[PDB]
Write a protein that binds this ligand. Structure first.
Ligand SMILES: O=c1ccn([C@@H]2O[C@H](COP(=O)(O)OP(=O)(O)O)[C@@H](O)[C@H]2O)c(=O)[nH]1
Ligand SMILES: O=c1ccn([C@@H]2O[C@H](COP(=O)(O)OP(=O)(O)O)[C@@H](O)[C@H]2O)c(=O)[nH]1
Ligand SMILES: O=c1ccn([C@@H]2O[C@H](COP(=O)(O)OP(=O)(O)O)[C@@H](O)[C@H]2O)c(=O)[nH]1
Ligand SMILES: O=c1ccn([C@@H]2O[C@H](COP(=O)(O)OP(=O)(O)O)[C@@H](O)[C@H]2O)c(=O)[nH]1
Ligand SMILES: O=c1ccn([C@@H]2O[C@H](COP(=O)(O)OP(=O)(O)O)[C@@H](O)[C@H]2O)c(=O)[nH]1
Ligand SMILES: O=c1ccn([C@@H]2O[C@H](COP(=O)(O)OP(=O)(O)O)[C@@H](O)[C@H]2O)c(=O)[nH]1
Ligand SMILES: [Mg+2]
Ligand SMILES: [Mg+2]
Ligand SMILES: [Mg+2]
Ligand SMILES: [Mg+2]
Ligand SMILES: [Mg+2]
Ligand SMILES: [Mg+2]
Lengths: 132, 133, 132, 133, 132, 132
């Protein structure tokens, strides 16, 4: 049944004016906002926690710098099968019909983060909304 | 030529969520044309049970009929090249973004739209909804 | 409070594929369909009844011929102040933001008819939906 | 330069009707930028009564506060040239198609969005919603 | 009442990815493209000619600079009452429902030029499309 | 991985008023116009060259006729992995989410051509934009 998932709207969505576009696509699939924060600039330690599984990758520091280059919005979304369905909505830059498929064309600057599992979800929600 | 007719139901959840034009617009933009259309403020359960007769022995059969009579429905006959299979692809499923259910639905039951899935289904569903054959 | 109004989607909306576009705009303003009929070709006497107040005008026969040149949809819409609000949504070809303002550019071929008063509404609903 | 900040509330009827992104998108497309934003699953009535204090003596005052706490709200500080008056025009009213209320709302109470109507209103409403001035 | 009119799509439209959005609003109102040129950077002479009437105004030089800061598209559009209609479609940054009304918020960067009279239309068409 | 690719917007897009819709989908994916020509009626030679690989197929002549039955736009687009990405955006009349997937239902009238390889892209760019 109901799941909650963590979504980040990335700084490129703000620069390109696609924040409502991305949010609108999740809204139209009937997912509801449980929690939301706007960060004019997200603290670097939060981004590094969020991406900690990536700490050894070559792209790690650069992606963090990107994630801190403009605003982000963190959202907890709720709905039936939210984790997997919001992941599919995110998609990838090769898959038309998805957010990244229609609107992104970059390895790094790809508009949206969504939790990919139950464990990452629980962990990511606790990073951005620790009051709970 | 390659011309076919198919049957589409707009389900009560579409009226509930104000998605009726969005769904029809998606079919319209693919160049399919309305041939007949009826608005049912509430559909006779008899008609629903016929429409879903192949499903009469499943657990979900009664809950679904219930939902199907819980608000309005629109039944539409559409026409165009390869209409049955193309409108079916448009309908898609709740897992495939880009399709109607993919973009707009999130439930096994409340899924906004029905399209005929074969030439045989279409003839039969059209007969159910537009008996004036 | 609640009113009902009569709407015709005209044959030019079918030819130009704007049926859902027009209907969508009324839907987004929170008006509900009470009754609807599709007419592959509307009987001429219905069109002539519908436009009877116009019977002496120079455009009368030509407009009827147009109205019979392709399909029409007649709809009874319900909502708060439906007559006047749907009229304003229809607008005219000079008023951006309205249906005719955004999508039409013709004296005759103007996509949509809406009832303009309580009396015309009651009368027009009885023409297209006489079962009541 | 001509830079201003304004306060916008997305009302509970927007969440109800799934119009939140549509409204925000209309402000986004006019090139206004979010400066601060908060999501309230339910807003303290105290905050609403302050926000609508100039209205405390009207018949509709209590019914409106009721509605304002009947579901979520988002409060947003927007920034851009002439932001107060331009976002106010975007909001418009239920009689003017082309504006947010014009296209999407049909009620005197449930009207989807509030925008500050003056420089004085904005400073005060921003203070209410984002007391961390 | 068939007319042709000249439209310029300004560099801010390319910057903000609003090109198709703007052209679509004109298309949806049933106007047709009669000719079109894409300029990666317009010759400054063309811009000075185009805004000649404004050569004495204080914003003239900055505006010319703006108009050469990115690509522009020059379009000749045709349709009934095209000059007046496309001008209304263009609108102003105050009134919603128009291109500028919905999408612009600046006295200089306002996305679209449209001819405002029969004379300026003849003139501007000859500036951008001299081959007639 | 910056590439240029050639896109043709076909006469059925003008007929159905889908020009901006199609161009917008490419724009929204962050591809840029590098050059563009509008042809009220393309020289048949250009069309024959363009579809040379198909000169032996049964649909060759009808297709050439179709391609000259109304306006076309030829566009050179640039961006990361542009040839492959715009091809996917183009898609096919079976799979929703693409231009053809959403908007076309014909084996001939399918709205958009996009180059399918590095070689055809060089070639087709030289056909429509010989000045390089
Ligand atoms: O080569 C890469 C791979 C990933 N990323 C960034 O790091 C994030 C997480 O990487 P992952 O491969 O898990 O992508 P995702 O799960 O978000 O699709 C991506 O979304 C990118 O923004 C990057 O900058 N370079
Ligand atoms: O577990 C289920 C499966 C089916 N349905 C309903 O019954 C219809 C027919 O079921 P089917 O599996 O054939 O789905 P469809 O072909 O419509 O995609 C569906 O559209 C649902 O509305 C349901 O309520 N519960
Ligand atoms: O000169 C005219 C005036 C009107 N009409 C048609 O007749 C309808 C009714 O005329 P009216 O002036 O009442 O326009 P409306 O009330 O629909 O705005 C219009 O919508 C047009 O389709 C026409 O063909 N020629
Ligand atoms: O008769 C009324 C008038 C006002 N309102 C509510 O109170 C708010 C403030 O009223 P106002 O007349 O100032 O409208 P606004 O400035 O918001 O357009 C409105 O947005 C409505 O939500 C109401 O419920 N009933
Ligand atoms: O104070 C001003 C007024 C005008 N303009 C620019 O000059 C153009 C022509 O000015 P005009 O007042 O004629 O505007 P328009 O007729 O295009 O609305 C405008 O579109 C703006 O881009 C400007 O830069 N500063
Ligand atoms: O049976 C056919 C197949 C192709 N075409 C046309 O010829 C073009 C090139 O054919 P191809 O199979 O290469 O299609 P594409 O690569 O563009 O998908 C298509 O876009 C169609 O417009 C046609 O008219 N009849
Ligand atoms: Mg990952
Ligand atoms: Mg089935
Ligand atoms: Mg009238
Ligand atoms: Mg007020
Ligand atoms: Mg001027
Ligand atoms: Mg090919």
């Amino acid at each position: 049944g109901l799941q909650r998932t963590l979504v980040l709207i990335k700084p490129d969505a703000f620069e390109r004016s696609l924040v409502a576009e991305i949010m609108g696509r999740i809204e139209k699939k009937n997912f509801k906002i449980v929690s939301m924060k706007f960060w004019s600039k997200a603290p670097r330690n939060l981004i590094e926690q969020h991406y900690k599984e990536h700490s050894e990758q070559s792209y790690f520091n650069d992606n963090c710098d990107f994630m801190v280059s403009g605003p982000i919005i963190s959202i907890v979304y709720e709905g039936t099968d939210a984790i997997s369905k919001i992941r599919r909505l995110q998609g990838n830059i090769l898959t038309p019909g998805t957010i990244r498929g229609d609107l992104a064309n970059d390895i790094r600057e790809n508009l949206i983060h969504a939790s990919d599992s139950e464990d990452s979800a629980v962990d990511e929600i606790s990073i951005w909304f620790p009051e709970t």
